[PDB]
Motif scaffolding. Structure first.
Motif, PDB file in Angstrom:
ATOM      1  N   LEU A   1       0.819  -1.209   0.000  1.00 19.40           N
ATOM      2  CA  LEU A   1       0.000   0.000   0.000  1.00 19.40           C
ATOM      3  C   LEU A   1       0.855   1.262   0.000  1.00 19.40           C
ATOM      4  O   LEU A   1       0.606   2.181  -0.788  1.00 19.40           O
ATOM      5  CB  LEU A   1      -0.966  -0.001   1.185  1.00 19.40           C
ATOM      6  CG  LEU A   1      -2.254  -0.804   0.980  1.00 19.40           C
ATOM      7  CD1 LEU A   1      -2.135  -2.221   1.541  1.00 19.40           C
ATOM      8  CD2 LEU A   1      -3.447  -0.066   1.578  1.00 19.40           C
ATOM      9  N   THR A   2       1.858   1.336   0.880  1.00 21.54           N
ATOM     10  CA  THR A   2       2.665   2.551   0.949  1.00 21.54           C
ATOM     11  C   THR A   2       3.506   2.713  -0.310  1.00 21.54           C
ATOM     12  O   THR A   2       3.583   3.808  -0.880  1.00 21.54           O
ATOM     13  CB  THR A   2       3.561   2.556   2.192  1.00 21.54           C
ATOM     14  OG1 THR A   2       4.422   3.697   2.144  1.00 21.54           O
ATOM     15  CG2 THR A   2       4.440   1.321   2.244  1.00 21.54           C
ATOM     16  N   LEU A   3       4.141   1.629  -0.765  1.00 24.86           N
ATOM     17  CA  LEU A   3       4.922   1.710  -1.991  1.00 24.86           C
ATOM     18  C   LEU A   3       4.025   2.043  -3.170  1.00 24.86           C
ATOM     19  O   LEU A   3       4.342   2.933  -3.965  1.00 24.86           O
ATOM     20  CB  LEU A   3       5.674   0.400  -2.232  1.00 24.86           C
ATOM     21  CG  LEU A   3       7.155   0.385  -1.848  1.00 24.86           C
ATOM     22  CD1 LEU A   3       7.852  -0.835  -2.430  1.00 24.86           C
ATOM     23  CD2 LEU A   3       7.843   1.666  -2.299  1.00 24.86           C
ATOM     24  N   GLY A   4       2.879   1.366  -3.274  1.00 31.72           N
ATOM     25  CA  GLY A   4       1.960   1.643  -4.365  1.00 31.72           C
ATOM     26  C   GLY A   4       1.431   3.064  -4.344  1.00 31.72           C
ATOM     27  O   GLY A   4       1.334   3.714  -5.388  1.00 31.72           O
ATOM     28  N   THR A   5       1.081   3.566  -3.156  1.00 32.50           N
ATOM     29  CA  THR A   5       0.648   4.954  -3.035  1.00 32.50           C
ATOM     30  C   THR A   5       1.719   5.907  -3.554  1.00 32.50           C
ATOM     31  O   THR A   5       1.405   6.923  -4.186  1.00 32.50           O
ATOM     32  CB  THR A   5       0.299   5.272  -1.578  1.00 32.50           C
ATOM     33  OG1 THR A   5      -0.750   4.400  -1.134  1.00 32.50           O
ATOM     34  CG2 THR A   5      -0.164   6.712  -1.431  1.00 32.50           C
ATOM     35  N   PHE A   6       2.992   5.577  -3.323  1.00 31.77           N
ATOM     36  CA  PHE A   6       4.076   6.423  -3.810  1.00 31.77           C
ATOM     37  C   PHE A   6       4.127   6.443  -5.334  1.00 31.77           C
ATOM     38  O   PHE A   6       4.311   7.506  -5.940  1.00 31.77           O
ATOM     39  CB  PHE A   6       5.411   5.948  -3.234  1.00 31.77           C
ATOM     40  CG  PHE A   6       5.617   6.294  -1.783  1.00 31.77           C
ATOM     41  CD1 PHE A   6       4.661   7.005  -1.075  1.00 31.77           C
ATOM     42  CD2 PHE A   6       6.778   5.912  -1.132  1.00 31.77           C
ATOM     43  CE1 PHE A   6       4.858   7.322   0.258  1.00 31.77           C
ATOM     44  CE2 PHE A   6       6.980   6.226   0.199  1.00 31.77           C
ATOM     45  CZ  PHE A   6       6.020   6.931   0.894  1.00 31.77           C
ATOM     46  N   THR A   7       3.937   5.278  -5.959  1.00 30.77           N
ATOM     47  CA  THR A   7       3.979   5.182  -7.442  1.00 30.77           C
ATOM     48  C   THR A   7       2.821   5.978  -8.034  1.00 30.77           C
ATOM     49  O   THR A   7       3.047   6.715  -9.000  1.00 30.77           O
ATOM     50  CB  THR A   7       3.844   3.736  -7.926  1.00 30.77           C
ATOM     51  OG1 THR A   7       2.466   3.384  -8.049  1.00 30.77           O
ATOM     52  CG2 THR A   7       4.549   2.731  -7.046  1.00 30.77           C
ATOM     53  N   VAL A   8       1.627   5.811  -7.477  1.00 31.77           N
ATOM     54  CA  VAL A   8       0.448   6.513  -7.980  1.00 31.77           C
ATOM     55  C   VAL A   8       0.703   8.015  -7.986  1.00 31.77           C
ATOM     56  O   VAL A   8       0.679   8.664  -9.038  1.00 31.77           O
ATOM     57  CB  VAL A   8      -0.792   6.146  -7.146  1.00 31.77           C
ATOM     58  CG1 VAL A   8      -1.995   6.968  -7.583  1.00 31.77           C
ATOM     59  CG2 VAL A   8      -1.087   4.659  -7.268  1.00 31.77           C
ATOM     60  N   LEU A   9       1.022   8.570  -6.812  1.00 32.35           N
ATOM     61  CA  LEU A   9       1.216  10.013  -6.683  1.00 32.35           C
ATOM     62  C   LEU A   9       2.290  10.531  -7.634  1.00 32.35           C
ATOM     63  O   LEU A   9       2.111  11.575  -8.272  1.00 32.35           O
ATOM     64  CB  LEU A   9       1.580  10.361  -5.239  1.00 32.35           C
ATOM     65  CG  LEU A   9       0.509  10.105  -4.177  1.00 32.35           C
ATOM     66  CD1 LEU A   9       1.154   9.925  -2.812  1.00 32.35           C
ATOM     67  CD2 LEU A   9      -0.511  11.231  -4.150  1.00 32.35           C
ATOM     68  N   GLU A  10       3.419   9.826  -7.736  1.00 30.66           N
ATOM     69  CA  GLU A  10       4.511  10.313  -8.574  1.00 30.66           C
ATOM     70  C   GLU A  10       4.156  10.255 -10.054  1.00 30.66           C
ATOM     71  O   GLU A  10       4.431  11.202 -10.800  1.00 30.66           O
ATOM     72  CB  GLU A  10       5.782   9.507  -8.310  1.00 30.66           C
ATOM     73  CG  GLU A  10       6.472   9.835  -7.008  1.00 30.66           C
ATOM     74  CD  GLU A  10       7.579   8.857  -6.693  1.00 30.66           C
ATOM     75  OE1 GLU A  10       7.570   7.753  -7.277  1.00 30.66           O
ATOM     76  OE2 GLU A  10       8.459   9.190  -5.870  1.00 30.66           O
TER      77      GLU A  10
END
Ligand SMILES: CC(C)CCC[C@@H](C)[C@H]1CC[C@H]2[C@@H]3CC=C4C[C@@H](O)CC[C@]4(C)[C@H]3CC[C@]12C
Ligand SMILES: CC(C)CCC[C@@H](C)[C@H]1CC[C@H]2[C@@H]3CC=C4C[C@@H](O)CC[C@]4(C)[C@H]3CC[C@]12C
Ligand SMILES: CCCCCCC(C)(C)c1ccc([C@@H]2C[C@H](O)CC[C@H]2CCCO)c(O)c1
Ligand SMILES: Cc1ccc2c([C@@H](C[N+](=O)[O-])c3cccs3)c(-c3ccccc3)[nH]c2c1
Ligand SMILES: CCCCCCCC/C=C/CCCCCCCC(=O)OC[C@H](O)CO
Ligand SMILES: CCCCCCCC/C=C\CCCCCCCC(=O)OC[C@H](O)CO
Length: 486
Positions: A28-37
């Protein structure tokens, strides 16, 4: 309880609750980072006319969507399968996995289109804007994305171990091992060639070089073109005449001070020599260095300089001096010629390596290396051409130098950001493509299933670091984002 070819889907759910919580939170945290970037990358590109018009950012935009679409579909389905224990049918499961496969091969193909784009830039430099039109790039990306998703939809349409009663994969539910075989090979051969291509692009780009135009800017001239000449000549020559400068070393058979020293001797008998003035600079072989200093006081209109000079002192030298001679035997990079044309000195040079690529007819006079008599004619052709107004040509060097340098310096950067994107993709997906090849022939114990489960997080790491590459390696992205968010 799971040795059957058609094993229950529970046996792919290989993680224990403490393991699931760790993989979940990391997903979730890693994926949230990819989405936002990645949406930030796309927003910068999409909402700027000057960005979205370049096929370079159709390629960056492509990678952004390939990262964004694949990771989002993965994280949702991956943890729903592993932590929520989803029991989807064969079609809907193969449909969700298909979205993850189409997204990855799209990236291998997006890397592939860039490799072709650079290939034809190197092999046909002169025709590049006409062959890589923006519309041609748009559809080249468009269909590439379609061929990608078609490969992803084959199991859904029947290429799997259930519809076929073939052997099932131990990593991926419902997937036929023969379709697995086919998929690795197709991206393995592309990725392998892309590895060869990108190394070749980087080697060919480094075969050219450019200069920092800040130090070699004309703005620093403090005086007119003719007056700044007179004064520098006045320090020694104290006369007004065409000046030919040399700035190299005194080896025999390389930089060509030998060819120059033989030339000057045959111009000395001529009457037109008195109009000429020469300045030799550098340090080198003791046999011929004195040959020049034996000629500094024998004719008296030449300053040979044996000691070094600061690179910021010679900027005014290149601008005031009328001509620079480069009689080299080897010059893959005409860096000295670039710095002269960047200050307006007209260059007479040997037709060797970069000198031939940089200097054309409209910018300077070219002479075959190793013939000092031909060089003697060059500064004679430069004498009958010096009397007529040559400022119409003095500026051809002003812009040819600053444009050649920026195409060489540019191409260096593209070759670097490319391989940066490649290596991070390899060390992220290399382990994954290895565990599947271990599945194609071999069997997955509960351990290799578990490590592959934890190793699947690498696909979310790759999606997160790619936007960081664009952020650092693209001054254009930076200025666009910077202007949008003051
Ligand atoms: C369906 C769920 C999982 C994801 C939703 C996001 C999808 C629908 C979004 C995210 C990014 C989007 C893309 C971003 C930019 C472009 C380039 C433009 O020239 C055509 C549309 C296109 C290609 C968009 C299509 C729709 C898109 C792929
Ligand atoms: C497995 C996947 C990634 C394979 C991808 C194949 C790609 C590289 C291929 C397949 C179809 C090809 C296109 C087919 C037709 C045209 C039109 C032509 O006027 C210029 C080249 C262009 C635009 C091709 C570019 C390369 C292309 C997009
Ligand atoms: C079929 C082509 C492989 C593409 C690589 C995808 C990737 C390695 C990232 C991957 C895909 C799927 C999984 C899980 C394997 C489990 O055995 C069952 C559930 C999968 C997640 C749900 C996919 O929608 C994985 O760990 C890695
Ligand atoms: C949850 C989810 C969301 C989207 C998809 C897609 C398509 C998008 N559209 O809705 O089909 C895409 C995903 C990534 C790039 S395109 C597939 C797909 C793609 C090719 C073949 C078979 C299935 N499975 C998905 C699952
Ligand atoms: C993070 C993933 C999303 C990527 C989306 C892109 C975001 C880039 C914003 C960057 C830092 C801002 C740095 C300031 C920008 C200027 C940097 C610079 O180099 O300016 C040189 C200038 O030309 C001097 O003359
Ligand atoms: C399932 C989805 C398949 C995924 C497909 C991914 C392809 C996206 C590649 C790049 C974005 C580059 C930006 C392209 C936007 C161009 C818009 C534009 O330039 O419009 C022209 C007009 O003249 C303006 O004034």
């Amino acid at each position: 309880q799971c040795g059957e070819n058609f094993m229950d889907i529970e046996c792919f759910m290989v993680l224990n609750p403490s393991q699931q919580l760790a993989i979940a939170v990391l997903s979730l945290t890693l994926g949230t980072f990819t989405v936002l970037e990645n949406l930030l990358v796309l927003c910068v590109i999409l909402h700027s006319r000057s960005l979205r018009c370049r096929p370079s950012y159709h390629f960056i935009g492509s990678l952004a969507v390939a990262d964004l679409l694949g990771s989002v579909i993965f994280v949702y389905s991956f943890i729903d399968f592993h932590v929520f224990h989803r029991k989807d049918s064969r079609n809907v499961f193969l449909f969700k996995l298909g979205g993850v496969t189409a997204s990855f091969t799209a990236k291998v193909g997006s890397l592939f289109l860039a490799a072709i784009d650079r290939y034809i830039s190197i092999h046909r430099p002169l025709a590049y804007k006409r062959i890589v039109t923006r519309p041609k790039a748009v559809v080249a990306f468009c269909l590439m994305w379609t061929i990608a998703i078609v490969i992803a939809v084959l199991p859904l349409l029947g290429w799997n171990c259930e519809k076929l009663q073939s052997v099932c994969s131990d990593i991926f539910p419902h997937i036929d091992k023969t379709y697995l075989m086919f998929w690795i090979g197709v991206v393995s051969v592309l990725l392998l060639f892309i590895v060869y291509a990108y190394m070749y692009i980087l080697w060919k780009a480094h075969s050219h070089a450019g200069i920092d135009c800040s130090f070699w800017n004309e703005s620093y001239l403090t005086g007119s073109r003719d007056e700044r000449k007179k004064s520098l000549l006045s320090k020694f020559g104290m006369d007004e005449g065409v000046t030919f400068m040399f700035i190299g070393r005194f080896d025999r058979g390389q930089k060509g001070v030998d060819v120059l020293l033989k030339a000057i001797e045959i111009l000395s008998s001529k009457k037109e020599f008195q109009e000429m003035r020469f300045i030799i600079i550098g340090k080198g072989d003791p046999e011929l260095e004195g040959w020049a200093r034996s000629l500094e006081e024998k004719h008296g209109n030449v300053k040979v300089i044996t000691e070094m000079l600061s690179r910021e002192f010679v900027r005014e030298l290149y601008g005031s001096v009328d001509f620079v001679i480069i009689p080299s035997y080897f010059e893959p990079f005409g860096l000295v010629a670039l710095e002269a044309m960047c200050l307006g000195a007209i260059p007479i040079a040997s037709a060797v390596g970069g000198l031939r690529d940089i200097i054309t007819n409209e910018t300077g006079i070219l002479v075959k290396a190793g013939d000092p008599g031909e060089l003697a004619n060059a500064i004679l052709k430069a004498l009958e051409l010096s009397r007529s107004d040559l400022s119409k040509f003095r500026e051809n060097c002003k812009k040819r130098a600053m444009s050649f340098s920026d195409q060489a310096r540019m191409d260096i950067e593209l070759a670097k950001t490319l391989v940066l994107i490649l290596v991070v993709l390899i060390i992220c997906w290399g382990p994954l493509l290895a565990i599947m090849v271990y599945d194609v022939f071999g069997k997955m114990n509960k351990l290799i299933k578990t490590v592959f489960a934890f190793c699947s997080m690498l696909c979310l790491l790759n999606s997160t670091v790619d936007p960081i590459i664009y952020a650092l390696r693209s001054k254009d992205l930076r200025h666009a984002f910077r202007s949008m968010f003051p």
